[PDB]
């Protein structure tokens, strides 16, 4: 149907958007800590901690897939990132702190893509 497509051309233009929002919160991590899944090889305990492990790749992947229908399970995803970090390692660590100013300089950016999903609809 028309309706059908019309329903995919707004999926792919959100994809759009979220890509963009996705490159934008991952500049706040310019040391990589949150590119990748954590290796269960190297923290082989991880899964015992964390029972939802997240990281940008994971993020990308589903993107392109154009797997995220709305902002809100895009932002979901993100706040796993963020949350997994700030409970496995404590206060005190690179991990944490680097947690820390990406969620604080990331708010900053989808305050303004929430005004745009809404926005343009």
Do not use: W
Not at 40 to 52: G, M, Q
Not at 93 to 108: E, H, I, K, M, S
Not at 115 to 120: A, N, Y
């Amino acid at each position: 149907s028309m309706e059908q497509v019309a329903m995919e051309l707004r999926l792919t233009e959100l994809t759009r958007l979220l890509r963009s929002v996705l490159d934008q919160l991952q500049d706040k991590d310019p040391a990589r800590i949150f590119a990748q899944p954590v290796s269960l090889k190297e923290v082989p305990d991880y899964l015992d901690h964390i029972k939802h492990p997240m990281d940008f790749a994971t993020m990308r992947k589903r993107l392109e897939a154009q797997g995220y229908k709305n902002l809100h399970e895009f932002e979901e995803d993100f706040d796993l990132i963020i949350d997994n970090c700030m409970k496995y390692n404590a206060r005190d660590t690179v991990f944490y702190r680097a947690a820390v100013r990406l969620r604080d300089q990331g708010g900053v950016v989808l305050r303004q893509a929430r005004r745009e999903v809404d926005s343009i609809g």
